[PDB]
């Protein structure tokens, strides 16, 4: 009754200290990611900064492919998220082998949240100190069209969709900027270029350094091309120049 | 890690198991239920929590299997619980399973003492093995079998059980034991025995004009057989009377409550 | 599964769990066993008449087998588990060898079970001490005692439970070898009454003879208890 | 106390549970062992808790096989497990090789059983603690009379004259003198009786101790009766 | 590997871990349920942390089977395990008896998992409370289940933050012969009383058990009930 | 307090202190350097000997994992041997299940996943060594570093150990675009000799390995008469 | 099947008889082997089959009954309960790896009131048991080659209210018929009876 | 110290104290010396001397295979377990390939076995050190293992109580071991072992075991009777 915060047991206030501490491991590395969705595509931008000039910049990345049509971004303890990515991939593969169809993004997010909740109820397991952001396209009924989808999974196992979201260091400022921009325009009616400009502007305003192209990596899913792929640096450069006006 | 292990199934410097004692203390705060074992039936009378105006009754058919305090284990076995109700449900399911397994193996009703013993080993197992907390519940078992007739048993959250002619568990159990000792005899009828139950309950809960919305009563008696069909198995002996467990309703309990409280005035008016 | 080491050694070479089980035995109801020329007498404390217990009699001395009887001091539920194990062992023995288990064989089995309870991970020792009496198939009365540590020893007169050491030291200087059936019943009560109250309704005594074990009735018990208490008054008068 | 685990090392390098189990041996009764060209002698102090105890029901010397005896000191309840394991292994050796099992092999099997303690369940259920027993195994084999000593750490050691229990250091001090390579069996018996006399708080009687002998020429174990012990004393 | 129990008795006879779990179960948003002579309506409060949360993706009202629904208050991830277990139990019952599971049996099955996690080793109790509403052969039922495993049958109840005030408001307004849409009006008004802002059809989730089914209400239906109170 | 006794516990600021202690144990180990030379990878470690009677080659810290892959250990040598065994298991699984040599990035990811799994359970402790993976697979020359935390990073040049900062500064003076393995071996050996303190580690040896086109893309040790004397 | 067992129940007793034959493929090992095992004070079973399974089954049943009596403080089980226990054992055997018990049973017993509260069976009880786990209450039953020969004979001569001496004569007639009509030599028949006083070994009929 | 009670606990300075305690346990065992020549390896073990009449025997040197043997120091039970494991592995190898296990592979296996017990919570390190003496196609080999799992390939080494004197003596004659014959190697090992004895004890056959392995010499142990040729004439000349 003295510790009550080293293992997954309730505090007298009805809170889990080991899960709140895993939320601080997300913002500990100092990295930030912003995910947005336009009328026909979904983009995610993650800080990719390499202070060590002897480090191969293209070896380390926070963007992962879960399935050809579902991409992921991990924010927090870098190895931990990697582990979750593996789990996600397995949760895809088994699903593909069980039902014969590719796993929906919402179902994958729900199952990943179920996996996280287990580590918050079993004593010996440590929660993964990362926030997972899955982006993809969802096949709609009664019309057959695809719609962009963002789903975040917390270390507590909380799963939720988003029109736009931010995660990491100074995520509150990015969310405030996105909410302020949302009061005027309608994000679900914008184009890919406008959504990318808004996301990069929010990322810059959260940190206030006017990032370059080598300092960020962007992943993308589109309705025309449902596959998840990373935006080339030239398009990111032109987006940044468009933002700089 | 082993640092945070509470070591539930361990001895203390006095040879006493602290988890068992704490479970006993937990049962002390549960609602009081009193069992009286007469010669023509066994009566259980327990105090249930004050009925909130928004409480709803589960519209169950067959309103004789389980009440708010009293449950049926088998056709010839009934029980009342005191303590952690959620712990009591699992043990009730286990007892029903054991009784039906015995009926499966031998095609005869399980003896009351045998059922009491089999569920006491379950409680004892958790105090020596597993490393988890024990069950914080006490059982009052009632029933009838051809070997000893009507019986009454009480179980502790340690595996220990005892047979009683009249007993009580829950709040003010010592006072109930003191009052039951004052007024109990072997030449006692069922309706007299129930009169002893309520009169002891209403005094342990300290009420005059015993409230019908806060008391529940169950009876293990014997009734004439109803579904005896000799033509379907000509070689089976069917007893004339079968044991019946019946939970009293609101309209059935108040005729006996009126006897209890007028008896209360008859016994308190002459003390001057 | 949970298999944490519960019984562990202490910096003074002591097993604290075993000592605590023994202390739990020290708080149990007293029991005495007396060995005679042709009978074994077992007496237990029979806590009290609560006036609320069932009128039907229940024995505090347990029939492990047709020839072997047991009494215990300590925790009742652990004792019941141990007695069930002993009965199952007797039946398994009489099913694998066609011969009835000897008293010493069963005593060794029970002592082994108690010992394993003190060396198995995730388990606390049994808080039970037992007095086991019986006859082999060739006469030979046998009386044995087991402790929570798993040590078994045969006695001519043994006591377990509360104040057992005082009873043992008292009957060391007054036990005669090869007593009769009536003497042993006389001897067990006067040894038991040294630590139980003079109230005559708290003794449960059973006599074992070859192929015959019978519990004494209440009146037959009263006849012996009045004699032993009267003898105690004459002993007190002889002292002073 | 559960502050330290059962597999932890002391800063001096010793296992805490094994060192604690060694101190339990010194709280037990005294046991002796003498090796001579004529045979091996085991002696033990009974220390009955009362005069009402049947002295034969607390045998401190147990027969592993017709040529191998074992005397224990410490916790007699745990010693029964070791002696049963030794008996089973000796019978298995006789079954498989049609020959008596050597004393060293029997001690090896006993220590092999003893070492299997710990807390990690995994695949095999281990003992929660080491045995609080020190064994003294005597026998006669193709290498003549052999005496071995077993520790709770699982370490077997061949000895010429070893004593375990409470009166161990005094018995060793007597061993330094009054002992040689080629004592006769009677001299060894008298030495054992005198050493028991020197380390016994109670008075020595024929029924107060237990003596056994495995003879080199006979090759068999011989438990001594109280009259034989008196005959030893009357010399 | 964490085989010892985390919930143990205290010197006062209290299982303080279960009490802490109950405290956690009362910190969620306000949910409530109302029974009526022809159906049960349960309403929750989907207050998203931001306007960028896509309130259509967050759900607080769940369908357990074609005849039974549920809502909760407390830890959502804790609740989802029980929701999945209840759905699987309903499917297994339909496979076994070819009948819809009665609400009482489903509530018993849910309560057994609560007890399992409050007594088995290496796990902590759940931090959520459930409101189960459904139809069975003996009518309409609304149950409340707490982290201790105890369950009650209610005519009108509320869980979460502000639940004492919601229950007090429901006590005076509830009527023994209240009919369906009257119960929906009462539930919406009770939510509105403790609501921090304005109730929109994207801010609330409501499910009305109507005579054979649970049928979580659509956005248009909730607008049709929101513009009427 | 009790917030740093096991890996399954986060600190109040979101840290795992046992992993940091393992990394500190790595930081007290002998210096190692590695360079990716656009035509191969060269790794060089210093071995400190506590005895002058050790046979040559004792306490090897560079071990071949596959034909084209190898691992250098910086830290607790037995933990590095366990990691090398796991990497060898991963490499032969690819050659047996998929009939292809394991890619350097794939092997590095497997090593990182294996090392990370020991930082999440209370029953295990993190490895007290860093792994330098040098591969020449179908994805070209690859040089990766796996942290006791389980995070892997690719490098052109990397330094680990006690004399890490000075060795890294010396590595910053190389070009890594015109650098070739033939001169990179000498460069790394010279850096290790210069950065090492001669008054605390009396017995020291330089152990250099490489995998480039000159060895038919096979991870082997250098010829004995190729490293500088000092 | 080679050995014939006979049983019939009357108003105050049940008489059973079991051939004592034991053979090795044509060789009479012995002709005096008791195949009637007494289970309780007032219960017995006449079992036909080879020695191994028969002895194992009877000893298992008897040991389990004794263990139940021990754990129930000397409470004796009724004939129906014991018969159902044997039937459950036999039925479980036929779906097990070790296979079915190749034993055919005639279970006889006498039910007495265990206490003053008892209201169960008081007369004698007889049960036919197939090796597959069939259980049937019968006035008389038979196993073996001679079984049919006896059965019709019983159908001709059995009466519910036969006396002990007339029942003994009837059993003698049945044994004589088995000896007369069966090629398998069943010279000795090991007759026992169950009455209110327990089990009696009858030597007059053989 | 609150970081020494468990094996899966890292010290804040990056240390594992349980393994250090196991090393301390190894440092308190009986002294033993290993010497490697050009074709032979010689182990010398210092066993307990009798107390003037009482000779106690304890097996420290084990024969692992026809070409392999070892000397233990520290916890005898751990040494017995390691001997059983090594013998089983040698028997398995010689069955599959009809030849003795190479010494480098053997040393790797011992190291892996040691490492298997230093990372699991329900395990403890082996409180014993080993000196492995063997011969294969690659020539003589001499290894030393420690509880941490490190295996050292040695020209000559020593371990046990007061073995620093043996090591500092060997550090003067080891570079010539490639030229000394078998008898000279035995004398060097005996001198190293004698450098580790107490003040009033001189090496003699009663308290010294000599193990020898070579190219045509299977691993042979030398004790009371067979050790007369090497120890009867021997004295430390300062």
List chain H domain ranges.
Answer: 1-238
The whole domain housing E220 covers 9-227
Residue with tokens 């009683």: B164
3-state secondary structure F94-144: HHHHCCCCCCHHHHHHHHHHHHHHHHCECCECCCCEEEEEEEEECCEEEEE
A205 contacts A173 by C-beta, under 8 angstroms: yes
Q: What is the CATH number of the domain that holds C227?
A: 3.60.20.10
Of E5, E111, E149, the CB nearest to B8: E5
Question: In the PDB record, what is the listed experimental method?
Answer: cryo-EM
Chain A residue nearest residue F158, CA to CA:
A54
Parent domain of G50: 1-206
> Is the CB of residue E139 less than 8 Å away from at least one CB of chain C?
no
- The reply to whether D1 touches chain H by the CB within 8 Å rule is no
Nearest residue of D to residue C3, measured between CA atoms: D121
Q: What interhelical angle do B112-125 and B85-106 show, nearest 10?
A: 130
Q: How many domains does chain E have?
A: 1
Contact call for D52 and C13, based on CB within 8 A: no
Å between E3 CA and nearest CA of chain C: 5
Q: Give the span between the Cα atoms of B270 and G18, in whole angstroms.
A: 77
For tokens 């691992």, name the residue. Answer: F71
Q: CB of C110 within 8 A of CB of C82?
A: yes
- Identify all chain G residues contacting B236, using CB atoms and an 8 Å cutoff: 137
Q: Which of C154, C129, C153 is nearest to C141 (CA)?
A: C154
In a domain, E1, yes or no: no
Q: What is the CATH number of the domain that holds E98?
A: 3.60.20.10
| H-run or E-run covering E182 | helix E180-194
CB neighbours (10 Å) of residue C102? 19
Q: Report the chain F residue with the minimal C-alpha distance to residue H121.
A: F123
Q: Do chains G and H touch (3 or more CB pairs under 8 A)?
A: no
Optimal mutation site among G68, G70, G71, interface C, most CBs of chain C within 10 A: G70
Residues within 8 A of E (CB atoms), B 151-170 only? none
Handedness of CA H216, H221, H222, H225 (dihedral sign): negative
Per residue in C22-46, is it b (16+ CB within 10 Å) or e — as a string?
bbbbbebbbbbbbbbeebbbbbbbb
Rounded (10°) angle between helices F77-97 and H103-115 = 110
Q: What are phi and psi of D223, to 5 degrees?
A: -75, 130
**Resolution, in Å, please?**
2.7
Q: What CATH class has B2-269?
A: alpha beta
* Min distance B85 CA to chain A CA atoms (Å): 22
Contacts with F150 (C-beta within 8 Å, 6 or more apart), sequence order: A79, A82, A83, F112, F113, F114, F115, F116, F117, F119
Q: Which two tokens stand for residue H44?
A: 């010398």
Q: Does A114 touch chain E (CB under 8 A)?
A: yes
What are the residue ranges of helices labelled H in D98-200? 103-115, 168-176, 185-198
Instruction: Tell whether B1 is within 8 A of chain F (Cβ).
Output: yes
Q: Subunits with at least 3 CB pairs below 8 A relative to chain A?
A: B, E, F
B vs D: CB pairs below 8 A: 4
Measured between CA atoms, how close is A235 to chain F, in angstroms? 25
Q: Give the total number of structural domains in chain G.
A: 1
Burial environment of residue A11 by CB neighbours within 10 A (0 to 12, 13 to 18, 19 or more)? middle
Q: Which domain holds residue C206?
A: 9-239
The domain tally of chain D equals 1
Question: Is the separation of the CB atoms in E190 and E32 below 8 Å?
Answer: yes
Q: Do C95 and G74 touch (CB under 8 A)?
A: no
Task: Decide if B7 touches D, using CB distance below 8 A.
Answer: yes
Report residue A123 as tokens.
């004593």
C170 assigned to some structural domain: yes
Give the pairing type, strands C139-146 and B215-224: unpaired
If we measure between CA atoms, which residue out of A35, A177, A161 comes closest to residue A105?
A: A161
Candidates H201, H198, H196; CA nearest to H163 is H196
Q: How far is E18 from chain C (nearest CA, A)?
A: 22
Contact A54 F171 (CB under 8 A): yes
A55 touches chain F (CB under 8 A): yes
CA distance linking residue H152 with residue H157, whole number of Å: 10
Q: Is E131 helix (H, G, I), strand (E, B) or coil?
A: strand
Q: CA angle, C99 as apex, C96 and C103 as ends, to 5°? A: 110
Nearest CA in chain D to H26: D13
The reply to whether E160 touches chain A by the CB within 8 Å rule is no
Nearest Cβ partner of D77 from C6, C8, C151? Answer: C151
Q: Do D12 and H123 lie within an 8 Å CB cutoff?
A: no
From the CA of E27, how many Å to the nearest CA of chain A? 8
Torsion of CA H7, H8, H14, H18, to 10 degrees: 0
Chains A, E: CB contacts under 8 A, how many? Answer: 95
Can you give the residue ranges of every domain in chain B? 2-269
Chain D contact set for B7 (CB, 8 A): 2
Please give the C-alpha separations between residue A231 and each of A56, A63, A216, D158, D205, in angstroms, as whole numbers: 19, 11, 10, 78, 99
Q: Are B238 and B72 in contact (CB under 8 A)?
A: no
- Minimal CA–CA distance to E2: which of F120, B1, F4? B1
Contact assignment for D129 to C152 by CB distance below 8 Å: no
For chains F and A, tell me whether 3 or more CB atom pairs sit within 8 A of each other. Answer: yes
CB contact, 8 Å: B7 with chain C?
yes
Q: Which residues of B touch G72 (CB under 8 A)?
A: 111, 113-114
CB of A25 within 8 Å of any CB in chain F? yes
Cα Rg of chain H (Å, integer): 18
CA distance to partner chain C, nearest, from residue E122 (Å): 10
How many beta carbons lie within 10 A of that of residue E88, not counting itself? 12
Q: B19 contacts in E (CB within 8 Å)?
A: 8-9
Question: What is the secondary structure of chain B as a DSSP string?
Answer: -GGG---SS---TTS--HHHHHHHHHHHTSPPEEEEE-SS-EEEEEEPPPPPTTB-----SSTTSB-SSEEEEETTEEEEEEE-HHHHHHHHHHHHHHHHHHHHHHSSPPPHHHHHHHHHHHHHHTTTSSSS----EEEEEEEEETTTEEEEEEE-TTS-EEEBSEEEESTTHHHHHHHHHHS--SS--HHHHHHHHHHHHHHHTT-SS--TTSEEEEEEEEEE-S---GGGSTT----SEEEEEEE--HHHHHHHHHHHHHHHHHHHTT--
Q: Are A123 and A5 in contact (CB under 8 A)?
A: no
> Which residue, E75, E191, E196, is CA-closest to E205?
E191
Q: Classify E169 as helix, strand or coil.
A: helix
C-beta of residue D137 within 8 angstroms of C-beta of residue D147: yes
The answer, for A174 touching chain E at a CB cutoff of 8 Å, is no
Tokens of C204: 């449960």
At B137, phi and psi to the nearest 5?
A: -145, 145
Chain breaks in chain F (C to N over 2.5 A) after: none
Residue G59 and residue C98: Cβ atoms within 8 Å? yes
Name which of D27, D50, D56, D88 to mutate to probe chain C: the one with the most chain C Cβ atoms within 10 A of its Cβ.
D50
- Taking contacts as CB-CB distances below 8 angstroms, the residues of chain B near C128 are none
Q: Which domain holds residue D167?
A: 1-235
Q: Which residues contact B44 (CB under 8 A, 6 or more apart)?
A: B33, B34, B35, B70, B78, B80, B140, B142, B197, B217, B218, B219, B220
G neighbour chains, 3+ CB pairs within 8 Å:
B, C
Cα–Cα–Cα angle for A139, A144, A148, nearest 5°?
40
Say if C49 falls within a structural domain: yes
Cβ of D121 within 8 Å of Cβ of C144? The answer is no
E80 domain-assigned: yes
């Amino acid at each position: 009754a003295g510790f009550d915060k080293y293992i997954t047991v309730f505090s007298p206030e009805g809170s889990l200290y080991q899960v709140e501490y895993a939320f601080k491991a997300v913002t500990y590395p100092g990295l930030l990611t912003v995910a947005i969705r336009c009328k026909d595509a979904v983009l995610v931008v993650t800080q990719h900064l390499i202070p060590d000039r002897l480090m191969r910049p293209d070896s380390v990345t926070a963007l992962y492919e879960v399935t050809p049509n579902i991409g992921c971004c991990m924010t927090g303890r870098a190895p931990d998220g990697r582990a979750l990515v593996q789990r996600a991939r397995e949760e895809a593969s088994d699903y593909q082998y069980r039902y014969g169809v590719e796993i929906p993004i919402a179902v994958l997010a729900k199952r990943m949240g179920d996996k996280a909740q287990v580590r918050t109820q079993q004593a010996g397991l440590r929660p993964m100190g990362v926030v997972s952001t899955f982006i993809g396209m969802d096949q709609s009924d009664q019309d057959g069209s695809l719609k962009p989808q963002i789903y975040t999974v917390d270390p507590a196992g909380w799963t939720g969709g988003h029109i736009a979201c931010a995660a990491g260091k100074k995520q509150v400022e990015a969310m405030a900027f996105l909410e302020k921009r949302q009061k005027s325009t309608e994000l679900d009616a914008l184009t890919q270029k406008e959504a990318a400009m808004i996301a990069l502007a929010a990322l810059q305003s959260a940190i206030g350094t006017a990032v370059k192209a080598k300092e960020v990596e962007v992943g993308r899913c589109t309705a025309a091309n449902p596959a998840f792929q990373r935006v080339p640096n030239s398009e990111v450069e032109e987006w940044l120049t468009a933002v700089a006006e | 890690s082993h640092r945070y292990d509470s070591r539930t199934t361990t001895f203390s410097p006095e040879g006493r198991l602290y988890q068992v004692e704490y479970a006993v203390e937990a049962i002390q705060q549960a609602g009081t239920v009193i069992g009286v074992c007469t010669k023509d039936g066994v009566v259980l009378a327990g105090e249930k929590m004050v009925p909130h105006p928004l409480f709803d009754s589960e519209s169950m058919q067959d309103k004789n299997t389980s009440g708010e305090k009293m449950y049926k284990i088998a056709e010839h076995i009934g029980c009342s619980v005191a303590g952690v109700t959620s712990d009591a449900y699992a043990l009730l399911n286990y007892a029903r399973l054991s009784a039906l397994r015995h009926q499966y193996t031998f095609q005869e009703p399980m003896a009351i003492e045998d059922l009491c013993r089999i569920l006491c080993d379950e409680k004892q197992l958790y105090t020596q093995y597993g490393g988890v907390r024990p069950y914080g519940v006490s059982f009052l078992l009632v029933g009838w079998d051809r070997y000893y007739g009507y019986q009454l048993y009480s179980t502790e959250p340690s595996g220990d059980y005892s047979a009683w002619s009249a007993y009580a568990i829950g709040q003010n159990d010592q006072v109930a034991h003191a009052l039951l000792k004052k007024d109990w005899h072997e030449s006692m009828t069922l309706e007299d025995g129930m009169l002893l139950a309520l009169r002891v309950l209403g005094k342990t809960m300290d009420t005059a004009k015993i409230d019908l919305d806060r008391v529940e009563v169950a009876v293990m008696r014997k009734v004439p057989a109803s579904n005896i069909d000799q033509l379907l198995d000509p070689f089976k002996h069917h007893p004339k009377t079968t044991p019946r467990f019946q939970i009293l309703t609101r309209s059935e309990l108040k005729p006996h409550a009126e006897r209890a409280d007028q008896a209360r005035e008859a016994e308190e008016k002459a003390e001057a | 599964s949970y298999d944490r080491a519960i019984t562990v050694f202490s910096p003074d070479g002591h097993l604290f769990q075993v000592e605590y089980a023994q202390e739990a035995v020290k708080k149990g109801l007293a029991a005495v066993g007396v060995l005679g020329s042709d009978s074994v007498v077992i007496a237990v404390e029979k806590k009290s008449a609560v006036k609320l217990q069932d009128s039907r009699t229940i024995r505090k001395i347990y029939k492990v087998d047709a020839n072997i009887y047991l009494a215990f001091a300590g925790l009742s539920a652990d004792a019941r588990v141990l007695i069930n194990k002993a009965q199952l062992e007797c039946q398994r023995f009489s099913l694998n060898y066609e011969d009835t288990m000897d008293v010493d064989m069963l005593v060794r089995y029970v002592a082994g079970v108690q010992q394993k309870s003190t060396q198995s991970g995730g388990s606390r020792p049994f808080g039970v001490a037992t007095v086991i009496g019986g006859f082999n198939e060739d006469g030979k009365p046998h009386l044995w005692k087991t402790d929570p540590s798993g040590m078994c020893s045969a006695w001519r007169a043994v006591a377990i439970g509360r104040h057992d050491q005082t009873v043992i030291e008292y009957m060391e200087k007054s036990y005669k070898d090869g007593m009769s059936r009536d003497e042993c019943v006389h001897f067990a009560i006067k040894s038991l009454l040294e630590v139980v109250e003079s109230g005559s309704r708290n003794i449960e005594l059973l006599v074992l003879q070859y192929k015959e074990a019978r519990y004494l009735t209440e009146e037959e018990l009263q006849k012996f208890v009045v004699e032993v208490e009267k003898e105690r008054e004459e002993e007190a008068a002889a002292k002073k | 106390e559960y502050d330290r685990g059962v597999n932890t090392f002391s800063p001096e390098g010793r296992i805490f549970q094994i060192e604690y189990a060694v101190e339990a041996i010194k709280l037990g009764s005294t046991s002796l062992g003498i090796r001579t060209p004529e045979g091996v002698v085991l002696a033990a102090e009974k220390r009955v808790p009362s005069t009402l105890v049947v002295p034969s029901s607390m045998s401190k010397i147990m027969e592993v096989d017709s040529h191998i005896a074992a005397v224990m000191s410490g916790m007699v309840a745990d010693a029964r497990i070791l002696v049963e394991h030794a008996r089973v292994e000796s019978q298995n050796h006789r079954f498989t090789y049609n020959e008596p099992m050597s004393v060293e092999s029997c001690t090896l099997a006993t220590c092999d059983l003893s070492i299997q303690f710990g807390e990690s369940g995994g695949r095999r259920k281990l003992m929660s603690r080491p045995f609080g027993v020190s064994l003294l195994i005597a026998g006669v084999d193709e290498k003549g009379p052999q005496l071995w000593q077993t520790d709770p750490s699982g370490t077997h050691t061949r000895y010429d004259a070893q004593a375990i229990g409470g009166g161990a250091e005094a018995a060793q001090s007597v061993f330094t003198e009054r002992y040689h390579r080629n004592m006769t069996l009677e001299e060894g018996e008298t030495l054992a009786v005198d050493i028991l006399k020197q380390v016994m708080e109670d008075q020595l009687s024929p029924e107060n101790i237990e003596v056994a002998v495995v003879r080199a020429d006979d090759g068999k174990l011989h438990m001594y009766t109280p009259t034989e012990i008196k005959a030893i004393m009357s010399r | 590997e964490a085989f010892y129990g985390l919930t143990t008795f205290s010197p006062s006879g209290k299982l303080i871990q279960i009490e802490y779990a109950t405290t956690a179960a009362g910190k969620g948003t306000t949910a409530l349920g109302v029974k009526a002579t022809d159906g049960v309506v349960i309403a929750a409060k989907k207050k998203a942390p931001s306007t960028l949360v896509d309130a259509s993706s967050i759900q607080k009202v769940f369908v357990l089977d074609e005849h039974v629904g549920c809502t909760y208050s407390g830890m959502g991830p804790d609740c989802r395990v029980l929701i999945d277990s209840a759905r699987k139990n309903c499917q297994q019952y339909k496979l076994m008896y070819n009948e819809p599971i009665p609400i009482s049996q489903l509530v018993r099955k849910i309560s057994a998992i609560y007890q399992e996690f409050t007594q088995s080793g290496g796990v902590r109790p759940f931090g959520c409370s459930l409101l189960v509403a459904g139809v069975d052969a003996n009518g309409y039922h609304l149950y409340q289940v707490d982290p201790s495993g105890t369950f009650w049958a209610w005519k009108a109840t509320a869980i979460g933050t502000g639940s004492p005030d919601a229950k007090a408001f429901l006590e005076k307004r509830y009527t023994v012969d209240m009919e369906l849409e009257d119960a929906v009006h009462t539930a919406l008004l009770t939510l509105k009383e403790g609501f921090d802002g304005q109730m929109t059809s994207e801010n609330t989730q409501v499910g009305r058990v109507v005579e054979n089914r649970f049928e979580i209400l659509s956005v248009d239906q909730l607008r049709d009930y929101l513009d009427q109170i | 307090s009790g917030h740093d006794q096991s890996t399954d516990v986060f600190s109040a600021e979101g840290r795992v202190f046992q992993v940091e202690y393992a990394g500190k144990a790595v930081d007290n180990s002998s210096t190692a350097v590695a360079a990716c030379c656009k035509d191969g990878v060269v790794v060089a470690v210093e071995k400190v000997h506590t005895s002058r009677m050790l046979e040559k080659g004792s306490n090897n810290r560079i071990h071949a994992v596959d034909r084209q892959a190898g691992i250098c250990i910086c830290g607790l040598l037995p933990d590095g041997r366990a990691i090398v065994s796991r990497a060898r298991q991963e490499a032969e699984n690819s050659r047996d299940i998929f009939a292809t040599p394991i890619r350097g990035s794939v092997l590095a990811n497997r090593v990182g996943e294996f090392m990370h799994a020991y930082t999440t359970h209370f029953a295990y402790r993190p490895f007290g060594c860093s792994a330098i993976i040098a591969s020449y697979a179908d994805d070209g020359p690859q040089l990766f570093v796996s942290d006791p935390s389980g995070t892997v990073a690719g490098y052109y040049g990397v330094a680990l150990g006690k004399a890490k900062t000075v060795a890294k500064s010396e590595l910053e003076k190389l070009d890594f675009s015109s650098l070739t393995c033939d001169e990179a071996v000498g460069k790394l050996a010279s850096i290790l000799h210069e950065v090492h303190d001669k008054q605390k580690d009396k017995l020291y040896e330089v152990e250099v390995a490489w995998v480039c086109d000159k060895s038919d893309r096979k991870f082997v040790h250098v010829p004995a008469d190729m490293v500088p004397a000092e | 099947m080679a050995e014939t067992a006979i049983a019939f129940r009357c108003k105050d007793y049940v008489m059973v008889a079991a051939a004592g034959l034991n053979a090795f493929y044509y060789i009479k090992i012995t002709d005096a082997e008791d195949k009637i095992t007494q289970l309780d004070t007032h219960q017995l079973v006449a079992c036909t089959g080879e020695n191994g399974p028969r002895v194992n089954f009877t000893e298992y049943i008897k040991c389990n009954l004794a263990l139940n009596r021990m754990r129930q403080h000397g409470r004796h089980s009724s004939c129906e309960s014991t018969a159902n226990f044997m039937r459950n054992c036999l039925a479980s055997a036929i779906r097990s790896r070790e296979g079915a018990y190749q034993v055919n049973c005639l279970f006889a017993g006498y039910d007495t009131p265990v206490s003053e509260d008892d209201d169960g069976v008081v007369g004698p009880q007889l049960f036919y048991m197939d090796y597959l786990g069939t259980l049937q209450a019968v006035p008389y039953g038979c196993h073996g080659y001679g079984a049919c020969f006896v059965t019709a004979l019983l159908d001709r001569l059995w009466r519910p209210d036969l006396s002990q001496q007339e029942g003994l004569e009837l059993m003698q007639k049945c044994c004589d018929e088995v000896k007369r009509r069966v090629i398998i030599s069943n010279s000795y028949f090991f007759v026992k009876a169950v009455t209110k006083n327990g089990v009696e070994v009858i030597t007059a009929v053989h | 110290n609150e970081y020494d009670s468990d094996i899966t606990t890292w010290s804040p300075t990056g240390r594992l104290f349980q393994i250090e305690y196991a090393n301390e346990a190894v440092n308190n065992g009986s002294a033993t010396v290993g010497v490697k020549g050009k074709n032979f390896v010689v182990l010398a073990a210092l066993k307990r001397s009798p107390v003037a009449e009482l000779s106690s025997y304890q097996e420290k040197v084990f024969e692992i295979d026809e070409h392999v043997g070892m000397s233990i120091s520290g916890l005898v039970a751990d040494g017995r377990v390691l001997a059983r494991y090594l013998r089983t592995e040698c028997m398995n190898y010689r069955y599959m390939y009809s030849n003795g296990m190479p010494m480098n592979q053997m040393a790797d296996m011992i190291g892996e076995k040691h490492q298997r017990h230093i990372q699991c919570s329900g395990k403890r390190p082996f409180g014993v050190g080993l000196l492995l003496a063997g011969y294969d196609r690659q020539g003589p080999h001499l290894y030393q293992t420690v509880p941490s799992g490190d295996v050292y390939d040695y020209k000559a080494t020593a371990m046990g109580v007061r073995s620093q004197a043996s090591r500092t003596y060997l550090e003067r004659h080891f570079e010539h071991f490639s030229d000394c014959t078998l008898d000279e190697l035995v004398t060097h090992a005996l001198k190293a072992l004698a450098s580790a004895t107490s003040e009033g004890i001189e090496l003699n056959v009663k308290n010294t075991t000599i193990a020898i392995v070579g190219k045509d010499t299977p691993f042979t142990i030398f004790e009371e009777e067979s050790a007369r040729k090497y120890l009867d004439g021997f004295k430390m000349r300062p």
